[PDB]
């Protein structure tokens, strides 16, 4: 085992970024020595370093007064992808559907959020898009078993490849965001669960169902922006 301090120091990475990688990799506490010792060689850590280089090289351009080169630095920017991070976390598809329990709870909460200076509108619109894709599929292939309306929200149970997932949807009212909660921890969980859901939904649609991603009717999205909108075709 190793202490948090010893893990942070060994990685030569910030605590925030240590915790970001810990969220992505599914690492939990004393940490396991071989777990941190296995985190050290990883593409995501290298891409975090690249983001740090990009950050200063952009503020160099902005701070001087040149705007065109800064705008060009945005064009020549690649970002870290959480693709290979799931293969090593959930190697089988039934294992990923065992995690989607907790994954769909964040994502359906983040749909029912007013956008703040913490969380951009693009983040909430993409999260809501995935939510609507999930709702569309479960209503398409007819996979509901149990419902439960509580004070908290509305619970559902769904035999998704025959393993009974559970997930919670809040009521469609404005939600009072406390200043107490940390919208930097939750954003990385969203960032991991989001990509996880993209790959799950591709696997589900391309196996038994439909084309991915489906289109949405513009004048249907103008009426409801819910579930009667977003038409989806089989072949």
């Amino acid at each position: 085992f190793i202490t948090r301090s010893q893990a942070v120091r060994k990685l030569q990475v910030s605590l925030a970024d240590f915790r970001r990688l810990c969220i992505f990799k599914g690492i939990y506490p004393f940490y396991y020595a071989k777990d941190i010792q296995y985190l050290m060689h990883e593409p995501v850590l290298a891409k975090f370093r690249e983001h740090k280089t990009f950050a200063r090289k952009l503020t160099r351009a902005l701070g001087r007064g040149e705007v065109s080169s800064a705008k060009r630095l945005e064009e020549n920017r690649d970002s870290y992808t959480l693709d290979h991070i799931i293969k090593e976390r959930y190697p089988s598809f039934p294992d990923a559907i065992r995690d989607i329990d907790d994954a769909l709870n964040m994502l359906f909460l983040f749909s029912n959020l007013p956008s703040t200076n913490q969380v951009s509108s693009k983040i909430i619109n993409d999260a809501q898009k995935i939510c609507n894709q999930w709702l569309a599929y479960v209503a398409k292939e007819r996979l509901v078993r149990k419902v439960f309306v509580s004070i908290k929200g509305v619970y559902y149970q769904a035999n998704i490849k025959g393993e009974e997932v559970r997930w919670l949807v809040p009521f469609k009212f404005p939600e009072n965001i406390p200043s107490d909660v940390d919208f930097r921890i939750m954003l990385t969980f969203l960032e991991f669960y989001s990509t996880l859901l993209h790959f799950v939904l591709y696997k589900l649609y391309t196996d038994s169902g439909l084309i991915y991603p489906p289109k949405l009717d513009l004048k249907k999205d103008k009426i409801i922006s819910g579930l009667s909108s977003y038409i989806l075709e089989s072949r």
């Binding site: 950050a55 952009l58 503020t59 902005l62 705007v67 800064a70 705008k71 945005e74 959020l113 007013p114 956008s115 703040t116 200076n117 951009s120 509108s121 469609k172 009212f173 404005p174 939600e175 009072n176 999205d221 103008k222 009426i223 409801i224 922006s225």
Partner: protein, 244 residues
């Protein structure tokens, strides 16, 4: 409490000179349009510009039909202090705060007042989803707190709060408020002053690395997607509120 530079203090007056003269100019032509003394003015009718998205500028005349608008506060232009005629209209629409929306119906009385505040507001006819998502995402109610405190503005969490405050007008729930807002009815003047204004978050929302550059990109997108006509025959710029 800071020192004020000379350049700024002359810039404010130099911009309000343009705004006082502009507002008086629009005031004269709109007063002379209503009294049917159209003998020698620029134009005796009302155009509306609808800019959509590669930026097509439409030129359509305003019908007598009552329409539904969602006015959004902007912050513009730069050095301007608001005059008396702007203080009045923006008090009546309760839009003193930046990044703040409100619903109003547009008639032949509403449209002349719209030309005055057009450099301060961005207007447009919203859709059913824009209205419905806006009310279920944002909503304030000014009413009494625990026992003593009055000025609490909380949230549209409940429907029984809707009952206690409206009720007898036929309104029972939040979705019924959405009904009387989307469709122009009897209870619209009742519920419009119940959701007083909306609190829209600002664009980009930061000063830093990524956020300054994104604000630069959007700031140059402003003057392309919005123009200040300044003339007494200013066509009212309508934009897509579904996109905004």
């Amino acid at each position: 409490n800071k020192f004020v530079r000379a350049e700024s203090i002359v810039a404010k007056t130099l911009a309000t000179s343009r705004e006082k003269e502009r507002i008086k100019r629009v005031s004269i032509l709109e007063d002379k349009k209503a009294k049917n003394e159209t003998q020698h003015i620029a134009s005796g009718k009302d155009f509306i510009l609808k800019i959509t998205e590669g930026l097509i500028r439409e030129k359509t005349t305003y019908d007598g039909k009552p329409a539904l608008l969602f006015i959004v506060r902007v912050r513009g232009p730069l050095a301007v202090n608001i005059p008396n005629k702007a203080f009045k209209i923006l008090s009546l629409l309760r839009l003193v705060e930046t990044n703040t929306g409100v619903f109003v119906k547009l008639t032949k009385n509403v449209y002349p007042l719209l030309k005055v505040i057009a450099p301060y507001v961005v207007i447009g006819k919203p859709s059913l989803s824009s209205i419905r998502s806006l009310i279920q995402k944002r909503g304030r109610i000014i009413y009494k707190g625990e026992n003593e405190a009055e000025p609490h503005e909380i949230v549209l969490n409940d429907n029984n709060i809707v009952e206690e405050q409206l009720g007898d007008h036929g309104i029972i729930c939040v979705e019924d408020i959405i009904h009387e807002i989307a469709t122009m009815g009897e209870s619209f003047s009742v519920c419009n002053f119940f959701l007083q204004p909306f609190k829209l978050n600002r664009e980009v929302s930061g000063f830093g690395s990524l956020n300054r550059l994104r604000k630069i990109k959007q700031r140059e997108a402003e003057s392309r997607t919005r123009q200040f006509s300044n003339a007494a025959t200013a066509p009212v710029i309508e934009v897509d509120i579904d996109s905004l």
